[PDB]
mmCIF file of C-alpha atoms and ligand atoms in Angstrom:
data_model
loop_
_atom_site.group_PDB
_atom_site.id
_atom_site.type_symbol
_atom_site.label_atom_id
_atom_site.label_comp_id
_atom_site.label_asym_id
_atom_site.label_seq_id
_atom_site.Cartn_x
_atom_site.Cartn_y
_atom_site.Cartn_z
ATOM 1 C CA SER A 6 -7.273 39.584 59.324
ATOM 2 C CA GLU A 7 -4.272 37.588 60.709
ATOM 3 C CA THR A 8 -6.305 36.276 63.748
ATOM 4 C CA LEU A 9 -8.923 34.223 61.778
ATOM 5 C CA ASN A 10 -7.609 31.078 59.901
ATOM 6 C CA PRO A 11 -3.875 31.665 60.748
ATOM 7 C CA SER A 12 -2.992 28.122 59.513
ATOM 8 C CA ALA A 13 -4.478 28.975 55.984
ATOM 9 C CA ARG A 14 -6.386 25.626 55.839
ATOM 10 C CA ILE A 15 -9.354 24.993 53.436
ATOM 11 C CA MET A 16 -12.732 25.550 55.208
ATOM 12 C CA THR A 17 -16.130 23.843 54.579
ATOM 13 C CA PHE A 18 -19.479 25.672 55.045
ATOM 14 C CA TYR A 19 -22.969 24.211 55.598
ATOM 15 C CA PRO A 20 -25.498 27.107 55.035
ATOM 16 C CA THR A 21 -29.242 26.921 55.853
ATOM 17 C CA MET A 22 -31.831 27.755 53.126
ATOM 18 C CA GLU A 23 -32.113 31.405 54.470
ATOM 19 C CA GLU A 24 -28.260 31.839 54.539
ATOM 20 C CA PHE A 25 -27.984 30.236 51.034
ATOM 21 C CA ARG A 26 -30.524 32.607 49.305
ATOM 22 C CA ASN A 27 -28.128 35.646 49.180
ATOM 23 C CA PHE A 28 -24.940 34.704 47.205
ATOM 24 C CA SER A 29 -22.717 37.785 47.657
ATOM 25 C CA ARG A 30 -23.743 38.208 51.353
ATOM 26 C CA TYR A 31 -22.526 34.609 51.997
ATOM 27 C CA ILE A 32 -19.228 35.208 50.114
ATOM 28 C CA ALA A 33 -18.732 38.268 52.431
ATOM 29 C CA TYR A 34 -19.683 36.111 55.512
ATOM 30 C CA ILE A 35 -17.205 33.315 54.686
ATOM 31 C CA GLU A 36 -14.424 35.994 54.253
ATOM 32 C CA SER A 37 -15.210 37.299 57.806
ATOM 33 C CA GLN A 38 -14.366 33.681 58.916
ATOM 34 C CA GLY A 39 -10.944 33.821 57.130
ATOM 35 C CA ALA A 40 -11.790 31.328 54.267
ATOM 36 C CA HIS A 41 -10.080 33.435 51.514
ATOM 37 C CA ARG A 42 -6.637 32.891 53.224
ATOM 38 C CA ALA A 43 -6.464 29.239 51.868
ATOM 39 C CA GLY A 44 -7.224 30.460 48.288
ATOM 40 C CA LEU A 45 -10.023 27.806 48.069
ATOM 41 C CA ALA A 46 -13.244 26.970 50.040
ATOM 42 C CA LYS A 47 -15.993 24.278 49.968
ATOM 43 C CA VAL A 48 -19.728 24.979 50.344
ATOM 44 C CA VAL A 49 -22.230 22.148 50.981
ATOM 45 C CA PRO A 50 -25.736 23.452 49.926
ATOM 46 C CA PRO A 51 -29.016 22.631 51.847
ATOM 47 C CA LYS A 52 -30.254 19.016 51.225
ATOM 48 C CA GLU A 53 -33.665 20.317 49.970
ATOM 49 C CA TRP A 54 -31.982 22.448 47.195
ATOM 50 C CA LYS A 55 -31.800 20.970 43.647
ATOM 51 C CA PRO A 56 -30.685 22.959 40.505
ATOM 52 C CA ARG A 57 -32.196 20.331 38.094
ATOM 53 C CA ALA A 58 -34.817 17.541 38.555
ATOM 54 C CA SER A 59 -32.995 14.815 36.500
ATOM 55 C CA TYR A 60 -29.731 14.282 34.491
ATOM 56 C CA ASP A 61 -31.296 11.456 32.350
ATOM 57 C CA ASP A 62 -31.958 13.671 29.266
ATOM 58 C CA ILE A 63 -28.411 14.895 28.351
ATOM 59 C CA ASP A 64 -26.949 12.061 26.139
ATOM 60 C CA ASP A 65 -27.665 14.037 22.891
ATOM 61 C CA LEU A 66 -25.722 17.119 24.199
ATOM 62 C CA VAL A 67 -22.784 17.992 21.855
ATOM 63 C CA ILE A 68 -19.186 18.653 23.083
ATOM 64 C CA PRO A 69 -17.811 20.726 20.094
ATOM 65 C CA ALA A 70 -14.053 20.527 20.862
ATOM 66 C CA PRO A 71 -12.980 17.602 23.167
ATOM 67 C CA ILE A 72 -9.224 17.593 24.009
ATOM 68 C CA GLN A 73 -6.803 14.629 24.268
ATOM 69 C CA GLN A 74 -4.355 15.530 27.103
ATOM 70 C CA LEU A 75 -0.725 14.619 26.252
ATOM 71 C CA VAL A 76 1.542 14.921 29.362
ATOM 72 C CA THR A 77 5.390 15.030 29.196
ATOM 73 C CA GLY A 78 7.924 15.030 32.055
ATOM 74 C CA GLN A 79 9.511 13.385 35.111
ATOM 75 C CA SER A 80 10.429 13.918 38.848
ATOM 76 C CA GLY A 81 7.098 15.688 39.669
ATOM 77 C CA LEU A 82 7.484 18.342 36.895
ATOM 78 C CA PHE A 83 5.216 18.119 33.799
ATOM 79 C CA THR A 84 3.971 19.925 30.644
ATOM 80 C CA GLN A 85 0.405 19.260 29.379
ATOM 81 C CA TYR A 86 -0.417 19.621 25.645
ATOM 82 C CA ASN A 87 -4.156 19.857 24.808
ATOM 83 C CA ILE A 88 -4.939 18.355 21.321
ATOM 84 C CA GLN A 89 -8.345 19.174 19.705
ATOM 85 C CA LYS A 90 -10.435 16.177 18.576
ATOM 86 C CA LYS A 91 -13.648 16.083 16.446
ATOM 87 C CA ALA A 92 -17.094 16.847 18.050
ATOM 88 C CA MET A 93 -18.735 14.050 20.117
ATOM 89 C CA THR A 94 -21.930 13.561 22.168
ATOM 90 C CA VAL A 95 -22.072 13.002 25.997
ATOM 91 C CA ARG A 96 -23.151 9.371 25.069
ATOM 92 C CA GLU A 97 -19.948 8.823 23.001
ATOM 93 C CA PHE A 98 -17.817 10.415 25.786
ATOM 94 C CA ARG A 99 -19.370 8.247 28.654
ATOM 95 C CA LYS A 100 -18.708 4.981 26.656
ATOM 96 C CA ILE A 101 -14.965 5.856 26.241
ATOM 97 C CA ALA A 102 -14.720 7.119 29.905
ATOM 98 C CA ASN A 103 -16.193 3.822 31.303
ATOM 99 C CA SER A 104 -14.264 1.529 28.850
ATOM 100 C CA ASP A 105 -11.542 -0.881 30.166
ATOM 101 C CA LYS A 106 -8.837 1.322 28.573
ATOM 102 C CA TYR A 107 -9.867 4.614 30.336
ATOM 103 C CA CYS A 108 -11.847 3.541 33.520
ATOM 104 C CA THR A 109 -10.944 4.397 37.180
ATOM 105 C CA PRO A 110 -8.489 1.849 38.760
ATOM 106 C CA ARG A 111 -9.484 -0.250 41.848
ATOM 107 C CA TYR A 112 -8.622 1.538 45.154
ATOM 108 C CA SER A 113 -9.252 1.562 48.940
ATOM 109 C CA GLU A 114 -8.256 5.063 50.275
ATOM 110 C CA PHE A 115 -7.870 8.400 48.355
ATOM 111 C CA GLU A 116 -4.062 8.363 49.050
ATOM 112 C CA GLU A 117 -3.892 5.189 46.873
ATOM 113 C CA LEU A 118 -5.749 6.842 43.895
ATOM 114 C CA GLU A 119 -3.576 10.014 44.300
ATOM 115 C CA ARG A 120 -0.370 7.824 44.151
ATOM 116 C CA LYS A 121 -1.835 6.074 41.030
ATOM 117 C CA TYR A 122 -2.498 9.486 39.346
ATOM 118 C CA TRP A 123 1.061 10.926 39.794
ATOM 119 C CA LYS A 124 2.581 7.563 38.673
ATOM 120 C CA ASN A 125 0.389 7.142 35.520
ATOM 121 C CA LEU A 126 -0.419 10.758 34.376
ATOM 122 C CA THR A 127 2.016 10.460 31.308
ATOM 123 C CA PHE A 128 0.500 7.130 30.059
ATOM 124 C CA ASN A 129 -2.803 6.503 28.179
ATOM 125 C CA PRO A 130 -3.719 10.212 27.417
ATOM 126 C CA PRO A 131 -7.438 10.737 28.306
ATOM 127 C CA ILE A 132 -10.087 12.975 26.549
ATOM 128 C CA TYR A 133 -11.463 16.067 28.409
ATOM 129 C CA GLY A 134 -14.833 17.502 27.320
ATOM 130 C CA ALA A 135 -13.837 20.991 28.616
ATOM 131 C CA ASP A 136 -14.990 24.613 27.871
ATOM 132 C CA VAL A 137 -18.499 23.661 26.618
ATOM 133 C CA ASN A 138 -20.781 26.758 26.467
ATOM 134 C CA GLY A 139 -23.924 25.879 28.428
ATOM 135 C CA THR A 140 -25.889 25.430 31.672
ATOM 136 C CA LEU A 141 -27.570 22.447 33.382
ATOM 137 C CA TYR A 142 -29.520 24.735 35.774
ATOM 138 C CA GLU A 143 -33.318 25.006 35.324
ATOM 139 C CA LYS A 144 -34.641 28.538 34.480
ATOM 140 C CA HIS A 145 -36.677 28.898 37.743
ATOM 141 C CA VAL A 146 -33.661 28.279 40.107
ATOM 142 C CA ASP A 147 -32.870 31.613 41.888
ATOM 143 C CA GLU A 148 -30.264 30.385 44.456
ATOM 144 C CA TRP A 149 -26.574 30.292 43.363
ATOM 145 C CA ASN A 150 -27.528 30.156 39.602
ATOM 146 C CA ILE A 151 -24.090 30.070 37.831
ATOM 147 C CA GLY A 152 -25.703 31.599 34.649
ATOM 148 C CA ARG A 153 -26.916 34.705 36.632
ATOM 149 C CA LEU A 154 -25.038 35.325 39.995
ATOM 150 C CA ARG A 155 -25.712 39.191 40.037
ATOM 151 C CA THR A 156 -22.202 40.345 41.305
ATOM 152 C CA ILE A 157 -20.327 43.636 40.397
ATOM 153 C CA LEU A 158 -18.692 41.727 37.445
ATOM 154 C CA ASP A 159 -22.038 42.531 35.642
ATOM 155 C CA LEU A 160 -20.722 46.113 34.910
ATOM 156 C CA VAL A 161 -18.393 44.755 32.151
ATOM 157 C CA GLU A 162 -21.420 43.492 30.103
ATOM 158 C CA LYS A 163 -23.913 46.196 31.237
ATOM 159 C CA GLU A 164 -21.783 49.241 30.237
ATOM 160 C CA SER A 165 -19.154 47.964 27.723
ATOM 161 C CA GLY A 166 -21.507 45.432 26.030
ATOM 162 C CA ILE A 167 -18.579 42.919 26.165
ATOM 163 C CA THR A 168 -19.319 39.151 26.314
ATOM 164 C CA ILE A 169 -16.451 36.909 27.571
ATOM 165 C CA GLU A 170 -17.114 33.140 27.281
ATOM 166 C CA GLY A 171 -16.540 31.233 30.539
ATOM 167 C CA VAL A 172 -15.842 34.537 32.402
ATOM 168 C CA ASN A 173 -19.370 36.064 32.420
ATOM 169 C CA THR A 174 -21.155 33.045 30.738
ATOM 170 C CA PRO A 175 -21.327 29.415 32.126
ATOM 171 C CA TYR A 176 -19.032 26.565 30.982
ATOM 172 C CA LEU A 177 -19.616 22.776 31.346
ATOM 173 C CA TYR A 178 -16.754 20.240 31.854
ATOM 174 C CA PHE A 179 -17.286 16.526 31.106
ATOM 175 C CA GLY A 180 -14.507 14.575 32.831
ATOM 176 C CA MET A 181 -12.993 11.075 32.950
ATOM 177 C CA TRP A 182 -10.213 9.386 35.041
ATOM 178 C CA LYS A 183 -6.791 11.218 35.044
ATOM 179 C CA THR A 184 -8.106 14.386 33.239
ATOM 180 C CA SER A 185 -6.304 17.365 34.799
ATOM 181 C CA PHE A 186 -6.405 21.135 35.379
ATOM 182 C CA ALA A 187 -2.887 22.705 35.576
ATOM 183 C CA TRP A 188 -1.605 25.360 38.106
ATOM 184 C CA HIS A 189 -3.304 28.772 37.579
ATOM 185 C CA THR A 190 -5.106 31.801 39.075
ATOM 186 C CA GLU A 191 -8.330 33.096 37.390
ATOM 187 C CA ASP A 192 -8.298 35.486 34.382
ATOM 188 C CA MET A 193 -7.645 39.069 35.761
ATOM 189 C CA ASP A 194 -7.333 37.425 39.281
ATOM 190 C CA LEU A 195 -11.145 37.044 39.599
ATOM 191 C CA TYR A 196 -13.039 34.577 41.918
ATOM 192 C CA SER A 197 -14.621 31.409 40.418
ATOM 193 C CA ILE A 198 -17.545 29.117 41.296
ATOM 194 C CA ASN A 199 -17.432 25.341 40.568
ATOM 195 C CA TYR A 200 -20.529 23.142 41.060
ATOM 196 C CA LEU A 201 -20.250 19.350 40.449
ATOM 197 C CA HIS A 202 -23.628 18.217 38.853
ATOM 198 C CA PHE A 203 -23.092 14.404 38.943
ATOM 199 C CA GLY A 204 -20.620 11.499 38.759
ATOM 200 C CA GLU A 205 -17.208 10.684 40.288
ATOM 201 C CA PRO A 206 -15.263 13.222 42.460
ATOM 202 C CA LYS A 207 -12.842 16.048 41.533
ATOM 203 C CA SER A 208 -9.727 16.563 43.765
ATOM 204 C CA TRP A 209 -8.070 19.999 44.210
ATOM 205 C CA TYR A 210 -4.661 21.400 45.390
ATOM 206 C CA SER A 211 -4.365 25.010 46.573
ATOM 207 C CA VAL A 212 -1.595 27.492 47.449
ATOM 208 C CA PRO A 213 -2.505 30.451 49.784
ATOM 209 C CA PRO A 214 -2.589 33.904 48.042
ATOM 210 C CA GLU A 215 0.060 35.287 50.519
ATOM 211 C CA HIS A 216 2.548 32.578 49.292
ATOM 212 C CA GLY A 217 1.597 32.845 45.552
ATOM 213 C CA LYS A 218 4.812 34.728 44.585
ATOM 214 C CA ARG A 219 6.905 31.809 45.982
ATOM 215 C CA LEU A 220 5.202 29.312 43.563
ATOM 216 C CA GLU A 221 5.777 31.722 40.600
ATOM 217 C CA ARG A 222 9.533 32.004 41.521
ATOM 218 C CA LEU A 223 9.820 28.166 41.676
ATOM 219 C CA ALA A 224 8.003 27.598 38.291
ATOM 220 C CA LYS A 225 10.360 30.225 36.629
ATOM 221 C CA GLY A 226 13.433 28.333 37.923
ATOM 222 C CA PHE A 227 12.158 25.028 36.407
ATOM 223 C CA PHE A 228 10.994 26.483 33.050
ATOM 224 C CA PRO A 229 13.420 29.444 32.332
ATOM 225 C CA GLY A 230 12.804 29.356 28.544
ATOM 226 C CA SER A 231 9.033 29.704 29.143
ATOM 227 C CA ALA A 232 9.621 32.597 31.633
ATOM 228 C CA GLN A 233 11.768 34.614 29.115
ATOM 229 C CA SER A 234 9.126 34.387 26.322
ATOM 230 C CA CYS A 235 6.146 35.204 28.581
ATOM 231 C CA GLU A 236 5.858 37.108 31.913
ATOM 232 C CA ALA A 237 2.683 35.192 32.955
ATOM 233 C CA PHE A 238 3.459 31.768 31.322
ATOM 234 C CA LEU A 239 1.377 29.976 34.025
ATOM 235 C CA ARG A 240 -1.759 31.598 32.440
ATOM 236 C CA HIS A 241 -1.126 29.180 29.462
ATOM 237 C CA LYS A 242 -2.428 26.412 31.885
ATOM 238 C CA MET A 243 0.218 23.791 30.897
ATOM 239 C CA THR A 244 2.290 23.352 34.089
ATOM 240 C CA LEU A 245 1.729 20.337 36.471
ATOM 241 C CA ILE A 246 3.776 20.327 39.767
ATOM 242 C CA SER A 247 3.196 17.378 42.238
ATOM 243 C CA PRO A 248 2.541 17.833 46.050
ATOM 244 C CA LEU A 249 5.894 16.040 46.768
ATOM 245 C CA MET A 250 7.689 18.683 44.635
ATOM 246 C CA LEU A 251 5.859 21.478 46.591
ATOM 247 C CA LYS A 252 6.856 19.964 49.978
ATOM 248 C CA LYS A 253 10.525 19.571 48.808
ATOM 249 C CA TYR A 254 10.899 23.302 47.993
ATOM 250 C CA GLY A 255 8.947 24.498 51.079
ATOM 251 C CA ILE A 256 5.884 25.838 49.204
ATOM 252 C CA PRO A 257 2.811 25.777 51.568
ATOM 253 C CA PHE A 258 -0.344 24.019 50.221
ATOM 254 C CA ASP A 259 -3.583 22.162 51.123
ATOM 255 C CA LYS A 260 -5.735 19.363 49.447
ATOM 256 C CA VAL A 261 -9.554 18.766 49.142
ATOM 257 C CA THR A 262 -11.995 16.343 47.383
ATOM 258 C CA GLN A 263 -15.311 17.665 45.872
ATOM 259 C CA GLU A 264 -18.210 15.245 45.559
ATOM 260 C CA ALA A 265 -21.424 15.407 43.420
ATOM 261 C CA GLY A 266 -23.749 18.125 44.735
ATOM 262 C CA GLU A 267 -20.986 20.323 46.261
ATOM 263 C CA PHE A 268 -19.707 23.862 45.512
ATOM 264 C CA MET A 269 -16.033 24.968 45.422
ATOM 265 C CA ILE A 270 -15.020 28.696 45.584
ATOM 266 C CA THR A 271 -11.597 30.026 44.379
ATOM 267 C CA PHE A 272 -10.431 33.444 45.618
ATOM 268 C CA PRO A 273 -8.346 36.213 43.883
ATOM 269 C CA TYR A 274 -4.669 35.202 43.271
ATOM 270 C CA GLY A 275 -5.391 31.682 44.647
ATOM 271 C CA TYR A 276 -3.282 29.161 42.678
ATOM 272 C CA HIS A 277 -5.077 25.830 42.155
ATOM 273 C CA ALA A 278 -4.602 22.464 40.286
ATOM 274 C CA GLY A 279 -6.245 19.005 40.318
ATOM 275 C CA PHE A 280 -7.753 15.949 38.622
ATOM 276 C CA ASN A 281 -11.041 14.054 38.009
ATOM 277 C CA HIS A 282 -11.619 10.567 39.610
ATOM 278 C CA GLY A 283 -13.848 9.315 36.781
ATOM 279 C CA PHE A 284 -16.842 10.260 34.577
ATOM 280 C CA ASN A 285 -18.574 13.491 35.795
ATOM 281 C CA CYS A 286 -19.905 17.002 34.851
ATOM 282 C CA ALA A 287 -19.059 20.393 36.398
ATOM 283 C CA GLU A 288 -20.385 23.949 35.850
ATOM 284 C CA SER A 289 -18.178 27.048 36.171
ATOM 285 C CA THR A 290 -18.044 30.867 35.824
ATOM 286 C CA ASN A 291 -16.085 33.824 37.306
ATOM 287 C CA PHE A 292 -17.390 36.497 39.742
ATOM 288 C CA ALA A 293 -16.209 39.601 41.676
ATOM 289 C CA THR A 294 -16.547 41.565 44.978
ATOM 290 C CA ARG A 295 -15.307 45.080 46.012
ATOM 291 C CA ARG A 296 -12.029 43.394 47.237
ATOM 292 C CA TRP A 297 -11.263 42.064 43.672
ATOM 293 C CA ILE A 298 -11.038 45.606 42.060
ATOM 294 C CA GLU A 299 -7.461 46.101 43.455
ATOM 295 C CA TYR A 300 -6.369 42.573 42.234
ATOM 296 C CA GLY A 301 -7.706 43.272 38.698
ATOM 297 C CA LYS A 302 -5.735 46.575 38.484
ATOM 298 C CA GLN A 303 -2.483 44.768 39.531
ATOM 299 C CA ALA A 304 -2.954 41.454 37.567
ATOM 300 C CA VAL A 305 0.203 40.432 35.571
ATOM 301 C CA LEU A 306 -1.191 39.235 32.186
ATOM 302 C CA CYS A 307 0.010 37.084 29.216
ATOM 303 C CA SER A 308 2.190 38.994 26.711
ATOM 304 C CA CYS A 309 2.902 36.430 23.891
ATOM 305 C CA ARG A 310 -0.770 35.629 22.819
ATOM 306 C CA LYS A 311 -3.403 38.016 21.246
ATOM 307 C CA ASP A 312 -6.667 36.148 22.164
ATOM 308 C CA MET A 313 -6.105 36.473 26.000
ATOM 309 C CA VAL A 314 -8.748 37.845 28.454
ATOM 310 C CA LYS A 315 -8.205 41.521 29.441
ATOM 311 C CA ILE A 316 -10.878 43.640 31.208
ATOM 312 C CA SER A 317 -10.992 47.492 31.154
ATOM 313 C CA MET A 318 -10.621 48.401 34.873
ATOM 314 C CA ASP A 319 -11.719 52.079 34.180
ATOM 315 C CA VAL A 320 -15.474 51.456 34.864
ATOM 316 C CA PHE A 321 -14.704 49.811 38.314
ATOM 317 C CA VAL A 322 -12.314 52.629 39.407
ATOM 318 C CA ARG A 323 -14.810 55.403 38.389
ATOM 319 C CA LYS A 324 -17.733 53.952 40.448
ATOM 320 C CA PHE A 325 -15.968 52.361 43.488
ATOM 321 C CA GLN A 326 -12.736 54.442 43.843
ATOM 322 C CA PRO A 327 -13.649 57.983 42.473
ATOM 323 C CA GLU A 328 -11.084 59.658 44.786
ATOM 324 C CA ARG A 329 -8.205 57.479 43.375
ATOM 325 C CA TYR A 330 -9.193 57.768 39.639
ATOM 326 C CA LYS A 331 -6.769 60.673 38.806
ATOM 327 C CA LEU A 332 -3.944 59.071 40.911
ATOM 328 C CA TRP A 333 -4.436 55.680 39.151
ATOM 329 C CA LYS A 334 -4.580 57.309 35.657
ATOM 330 C CA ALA A 335 -1.252 59.161 36.248
ATOM 331 C CA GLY A 336 0.289 55.877 37.539
ATOM 332 C CA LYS A 337 0.776 57.315 41.056
ATOM 333 C CA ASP A 338 -1.502 54.672 42.724
ATOM 334 C CA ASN A 339 1.072 52.489 44.573
ATOM 335 C CA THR A 340 -1.293 50.447 46.844
ATOM 336 C CA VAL A 341 0.134 47.295 48.496
ATOM 337 C CA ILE A 342 -2.451 44.458 48.677
ATOM 338 C CA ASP A 343 -3.044 42.661 52.037
ATOM 339 C CA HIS A 344 -4.164 39.052 51.253
ATOM 340 C CA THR A 345 -5.363 38.411 54.886
ATOM 341 C CA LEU A 346 -7.936 41.315 54.782
ATOM 342 C CA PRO A 347 -11.634 40.407 54.020
ATOM 343 C CA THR A 348 -14.030 42.123 51.486
ATOM 344 C CA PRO A 349 -15.648 45.475 52.730
ATOM 345 C CA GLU A 350 -19.155 43.824 52.485
ATOM 346 C CA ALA A 351 -18.116 41.610 55.530
ATOM 347 C CA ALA A 352 -18.726 44.690 57.833
ATOM 348 C CA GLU A 353 -22.117 43.395 59.174
ATOM 349 C CA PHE A 354 -20.435 40.124 60.406
ATOM 350 C CA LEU A 355 -18.087 41.981 62.884
ATOM 351 C CA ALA B 5 -11.934 37.112 24.353
ATOM 352 C CA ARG B 6 -12.434 33.460 25.609
ATOM 353 C CA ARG B 7 -11.666 31.446 28.827
ATOM 354 C CA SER B 8 -9.507 28.367 28.008
ATOM 355 C CA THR B 9 -7.801 25.253 29.501
ATOM 356 C CA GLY B 10 -4.606 25.998 27.461
ATOM 357 C CA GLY B 11 -2.376 23.295 25.981
HETATM 358 O O1 LIG C 1 -12.816 21.750 36.320
HETATM 359 C C1 LIG C 1 -11.829 22.246 35.625
HETATM 360 O O2 LIG C 1 -11.075 21.577 34.973
HETATM 361 C C2 LIG C 1 -11.734 23.747 35.691
HETATM 362 N N1 LIG C 1 -12.155 24.292 36.964
HETATM 363 C C3 LIG C 1 -11.448 25.229 37.597
HETATM 364 O O3 LIG C 1 -10.217 25.299 37.580
HETATM 365 C C4 LIG C 1 -12.316 26.294 38.283
HETATM 366 O O4 LIG C 1 -13.525 26.163 38.436
HETATM 367 O O5 LIG C 1 -11.650 27.351 38.664
HETATM 368 ZN ZN1 LIG C 2 -9.679 27.757 37.983
HETATM 369 ZN ZN1 LIG C 3 1.923 34.171 27.397
#
């Protein structure tokens, strides 16, 4: 912890090449600084580091299921419907993105573009080239390689043999102006990594994990029909709530803009939302630490859909909590999570 | 299973 980052503000890190080499050790280090308390962090990599030599050979890359984003609502409360469109290349996507109809409006400060977004998000539905299976990293890149991070999340594939797309495999996201990502935590309350490869920025909104229940209570009051049908209806990723609506109901939050060549980290039970400024490309996957195991055991999942991501927590409890295995199996494990506490791997930084 | 953007 309550001493480090007591204001729960987003923190930016500038590691050296030596500090940047070990992924998990840096995640543990930034938690010893109190970064997890905001639910989101920014990491600027060393200037010498490059994951790919050039982005000039990706026009023939196929986006199998691009989505037209239809937004409905008023007074800072919205519902986003994602409509599947036919397959298109990155060349076909860039032409539409940069066309007069879908291009970024003229602006001075970010506050002006942010005002423009919340005023126009229901008009001219844009196309989002989201959830594309793939990587833009070169095979030889060993530092922060999204396709092979080497965290404890590797146990799900190593022992079960289970492959979950976007969770333990990389996803690419081709954006344009006004394309959004609704309010959500990660599947099973995992962490996530987001690298922006090139193009226009991506802006983010975050709610601290310790205040996450307050956002859930507010969303349930605004969409009571959605709450009755599904316990975790926010996992459907359809709800847009503006920063003015958050401020009105006393929900604490912070904002941040990610530029090309920067990393964003999301922490367990960290609610986040945002939008793209214009044409770009991002890479994303999920990861875990020893701190996540308790969040995964207590994650409230979607009940109405049968395709949803659910991980067997058994393998993590057997290896990391052998003393609690019988207690947890009998349902006698009644552990209360402390969101301010850092991962046990942060021991060497104290 | 599969990670999604919803809608
Ligand atoms: O970029 C997007 O639309 C999806 N990204 C995220 O929400 C993430 O990396 O957790
Ligand atoms: Zn996310
Ligand atoms: Zn549901």
